[PDB]
Amino acid sequence: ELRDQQEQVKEDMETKCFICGIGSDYFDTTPHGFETHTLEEHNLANYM
Amino acid sequence: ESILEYFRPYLGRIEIMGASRRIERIYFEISETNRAQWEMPQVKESKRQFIFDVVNEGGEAEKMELFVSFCEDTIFEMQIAAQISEFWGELEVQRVKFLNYLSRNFYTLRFLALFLAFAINFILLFYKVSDSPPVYYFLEESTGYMEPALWCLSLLHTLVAFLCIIGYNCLKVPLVIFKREKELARKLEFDGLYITEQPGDDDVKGQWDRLVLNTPSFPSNYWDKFVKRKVLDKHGDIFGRERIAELLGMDLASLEITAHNERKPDPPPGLLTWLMSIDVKYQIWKFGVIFTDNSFLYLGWYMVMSLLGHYNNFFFAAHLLDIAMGVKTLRTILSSVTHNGKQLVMTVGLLAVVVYLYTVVAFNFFRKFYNKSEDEDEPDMKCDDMMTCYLFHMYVGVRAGGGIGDEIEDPAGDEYELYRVVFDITFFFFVIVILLAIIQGLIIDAFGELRDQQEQVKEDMETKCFICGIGSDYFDTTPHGFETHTLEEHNLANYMFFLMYLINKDETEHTGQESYVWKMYQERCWDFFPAGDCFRKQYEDQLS
Amino acid sequence: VMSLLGHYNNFFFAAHLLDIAMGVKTLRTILSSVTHNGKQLVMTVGLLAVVVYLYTVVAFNFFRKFYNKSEDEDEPDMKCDDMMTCYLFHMYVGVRAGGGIGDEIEDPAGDEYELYRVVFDITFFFFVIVILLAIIQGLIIDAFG
Numbered sequence: 001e002l003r004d005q006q007e008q009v010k011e012d013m014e015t016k017c018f019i020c021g022i023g024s025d026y027f028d029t030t031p032h033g034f035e036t037h038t039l040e041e042h043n044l045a046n047y048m
Numbered sequence: 049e050s051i052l053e054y055f056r057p058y059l060g061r062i063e064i065m066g067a068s069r070r071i072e073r074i075y076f077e078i079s080e081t082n083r084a085q086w087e088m089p090q091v092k093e094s095k096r097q098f099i100f101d102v103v104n105e106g107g108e109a110e111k112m113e114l115f116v117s118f119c120e121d122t123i124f125e126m127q128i129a130a131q132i133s134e135f136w137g138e139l140e141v142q143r144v145k146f147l148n149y150l151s152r153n154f155y156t157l158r159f160l161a162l163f164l165a166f167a168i169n170f171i172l173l174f175y176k177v178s179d180s181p182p183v184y185y186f187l188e189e190s191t192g193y194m195e196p197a198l199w200c201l202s203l204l205h206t207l208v209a210f211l212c213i214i215g216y217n218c219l220k221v222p223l224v225i226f227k228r229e230k231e232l233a234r235k236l237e238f239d240g241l242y243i244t245e246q247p248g249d250d251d252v253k254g255q256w257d258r259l260v261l262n263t264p265s266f267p268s269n270y271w272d273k274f275v276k277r278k279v280l281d282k283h284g285d286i287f288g289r290e291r292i293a294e295l296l297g298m299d300l301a302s303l304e305i306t307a308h309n310e311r312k313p314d315p316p317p318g319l320l321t322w323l324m325s326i327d328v329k330y331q332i333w334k335f336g337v338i339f340t341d342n343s344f345l346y347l348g349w350y351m352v353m354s355l356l357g358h359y360n361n362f363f364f365a366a367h368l369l370d371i372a373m374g375v376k377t378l379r380t381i382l383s384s385v386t387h388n389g390k391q392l393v394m395t396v397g398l399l400a401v402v403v404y405l406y407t408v409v410a411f412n413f414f415r416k417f418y419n420k421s422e423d424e425d426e427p428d429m430k431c432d433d434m435m436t437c438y439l440f441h442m443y444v445g446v447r448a449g450g451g452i453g454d455e456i457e458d459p460a461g462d463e464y465e466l467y468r469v470v471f472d473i474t475f476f477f478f479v480i481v482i483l484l485a486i487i488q489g490l491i492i493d494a495f496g497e498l499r500d501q502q503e504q505v506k507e508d509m510e511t512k513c514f515i516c517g518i519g520s521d522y523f524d525t526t527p528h529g530f531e532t533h534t535l536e537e538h539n540l541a542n543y544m545f546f547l548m549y550l551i552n553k554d555e556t557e558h559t560g561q562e563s564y565v566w567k568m569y570q571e572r573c574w575d576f577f578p579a580g581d582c583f584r585k586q587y588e589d590q591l592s
Numbered sequence: 593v594m595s596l597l598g599h600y601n602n603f604f605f606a607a608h609l610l611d612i613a614m615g616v617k618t619l620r621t622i623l624s625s626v627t628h629n630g631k632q633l634v635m636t637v638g639l640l641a642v643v644v645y646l647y648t649v650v651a652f653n654f655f656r657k658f659y660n661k662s663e664d665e666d667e668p669d670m671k672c673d674d675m676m677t678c679y680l681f682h683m684y685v686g687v688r689a690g691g692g693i694g695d696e697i698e699d700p701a702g703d704e705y706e707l708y709r710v711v712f713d714i715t716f717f718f719f720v721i722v723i724l725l726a727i728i729q730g731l732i733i734d735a736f737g
């Protein structure tokens with residue numbers, strides 16, 4: 001159960017945007033779309 | 049129809065992003081020799097391993113970079129395979145024939161060594177010891193000459209060990225050297241590991257790589273022999289041209305006059321010329337990198353074990369563990385075992401700690417009951433001192449079921465009956481049960497995790513396109529859409545063969561698309577790979 | 593053929609009791625769980641044989657004295673004087689009996705090889721009794737899953 005919890009957390013963070021909630025599939029239409037969106041557009045550190 | 053059917057295997061097609069944003073299709077030619085070298089089974093195994101490490105172990109961000117590195121490595125390995133395919137000059141050519149034979153028959157030597165070890169152990173099974181002359185350790189059996197047979201088997205085993213060592217050195221090391229030189233060249237060309245930056249103190253490999261900076265044979269075993277000149281032209285202005293020249297061991301006037309015009313030297317006639325042509329520092333760095341390989345160290349351990357077996361025949365029993373690394377499923381089960389090795393050693397350390405605490409309390413209060421002597425007049429207590437009490441608990445209580453209390457005397461009939469009962473029950477529940485439960489569960493979870501990893505890799509490959517990333521659902525709108533797309537439109541082998549075709553074709557012969565791809569390969573820009581789009585997706589309105 | 597042999601000897605009919613395994617469906621399910629990793633199990637027991645063999649070699653080389661399994665001192669019955677009997681002794685007794693091989697062996701205390709025998713017994717207990725049977729259990733559990 002603990003291993004499953006860690007895996008679930010990692011997969012959820014790798015798949016969904018934290019601020020928006022939009023899946024990575026929409027952003028990945030454009031190359032590196034998710035990587036750009038989760039580092040430039042909506043960033044937790046940026047909001048802080 | 050006949051022409052298309054005949055040239056179908058040779059005709060290869062790939063898709064690129066193109067200079068314009070529209071996805072374009074490129075048709076080229078695949079050589080028969082290239083296809084055969086690709087269908088070499090070792091290439092298949094390397095491809096499987098690369099796919100597994102690029103899916104299971106992440107690396108999605110650097111997917112194209114890892115793919116390009118894999119293509120370069122595979123090209124180098126198959127060039128090696130093509131080379132090793134089926135007075136002084138006479139000895140040299142005999143030596144190269146011997147080395148080629150060993151390279152082609154390397155695996156058979158490994159299997160023969162395993163069989164030889166099995167046979168030697170089977171013969172050693174018949175040993176016996178006595179006091180009278182044949183202490184004396186002798187091979188006792190009805191039929192004679194068995195000891196001479198074992199002698200012959202031992203000699204053959206060590207000769208095979210020599211052959212395996214030479215085969216490994218002549219077959220596997222060049223790839224490691226190529227990878228290390230490529231990594232060093234990339235680091236000191238782009239990131240500037242040694243120029244405008246310095247390797248960290250913890251980077252032992254970074255400190256070790258400093259040797260070949262000035263050696264003349266630094267770009268050996270790597271396609272580019274002009275990396276030093278490129279780094280000079282890149283970081284000359286900032287760090288200083290003279291400083292770069294001193295760091296890289298180059299001569300400005302010499303390189304300039306060679307750029308203008310150079311003469312042709314003479315081939316080495318004999319062996320003394322090769323002896324003087326040895327670059328000591330480069331060879332030392334090569335030894336440093338090769339001796340760090342795990343497989344080379346294992347083979348050296350095998351050889352040392354055989355040499356010690358010559359001294360004492362029973363040392364050959366250590367070679368029976370070679371099955372663990374020979375048989376693949378042995379490797380799978382031991383990967384399950386060693387996936388949580390740190391977990392297991394830390395668990396046994398915690399067991400040591402708790403057992404120690406029980407020893408402290410038992411020494412403080414339960415000293416009387418630890419009498420382990422049947423003679424009352426000669427009592428032999430095992431908890432009078434802390435050392436012997438801890439040793440007694442570790443050795444006996446953990447191994448024996450039911451806790452430590454089974455060996456201890458009967459708690460009944462004393463004032464500490466309840467205290468001893470609680471002591472024994474707590475020991476049984478916390479040491480015997482819970483900790484070994486962790487030991488069992490770690491292994492079971494390791495098996496489950498590895499099975500899940502294989503299933504995840506298989507499902508990911510069966511569901512998503514490797515080059516594009518588009519799911520199979522979009523392609524399966526058209527019958528066999530995914531099967532067509534992952535075999536005709538975007539194919540890993542097709543991209544590999546296009547890379548080889550660009551390498552082989554002359555620069556002036558490259559078409560516009562080939563030159564546009566080529567520039568990018570050299571600039572290390574991975575934009576031609578179509579990610580998130582394909583020809584069908586772009587021309588769905590036009591029906592492709 | 594088993595029925596025909598049962599005509600010769602009446603006790604041969606007991607072999608037909610295993611027919612429930614192929615008759616009852618859930619018998620087939622549980623034995624499919626068992627046999628899903630049969631190669632895994634036989635290779636595990638082979639590895640057990642290999643490691644036990646190595647322990648027999650080392651015990652024969654050094655720990656020969658302590659393998660006396662006779663209560664009469666004047667009539668000692670050692671089980672590790674030769675390699676065959678030492679390997680047979682380890683296979684038959686040490687694997688079956690819990691706590692490793694050291695339980696049957698004499699007391700290591702009172703000799704110069706006390707620490708060596710302690711390490712020998714602890715390693716045997718942890719590597720043969722625990723880890724390998726853990727693999728045996730986990731294979732079946734993973735097959736069910």
Ligand SMILES: Nc1ncnc2c1ncn2[C@@H]1O[C@H](COP(=O)(O)OP(=O)(O)OP(=O)(O)O)[C@@H](O)[C@H]1O
Pocket residue numbers: 013014016017018019020037038039042043044
């Ligand atoms: N709005 C968001 N802001 C930041 N990360 C996001 C956002 N949406 C999704 N993510 C995902 O969260 C992941 C968390 O990675 P992160 O950037 O925190 O790593 P890190 O800095 O290396 O971690 P660590 O805390 O271990 O140092 C990112 O890889 C990204 O894919």
Ligand SMILES: Nc1ncnc2c1ncn2[C@@H]1O[C@H](COP(=O)(O)OP(=O)(O)OP(=O)(O)O)[C@@H](O)[C@H]1O
Pocket residue numbers: 092093095096509510512513514515516533534535538539540
């Ligand atoms: N661009 C792609 N190129 C190749 N395979 C792809 C691609 N995208 C997805 N795949 C999937 O990768 C799977 C890998 O199968 P592959 O063709 O490598 O099998 P194989 O040649 O039988 O394997 P092996 O390496 O065992 O000989 C294919 O079945 C296919 O569905």
Ligand SMILES: Cn1c(=O)c2c(ncn2C)n(C)c1=O
Pocket residue numbers: 119120121123124271551569570
């Ligand atoms: C980009 N590139 C390579 O990747 C390569 C090569 N020779 C071998 N390889 C792998 N050449 C000449 C090359 O230009």
Ligand SMILES: [Ca+2]
Pocket residue numbers: 556557558
């Ligand atoms: Ca031209």
Ligand SMILES: [Zn+2]
Pocket residue numbers: 017018019020021037038041042
């Ligand atoms: Zn967002």
Ligand SMILES: [Zn+2]
Pocket residue numbers: 513514515516517533534537538582
């Ligand atoms: Zn594709």
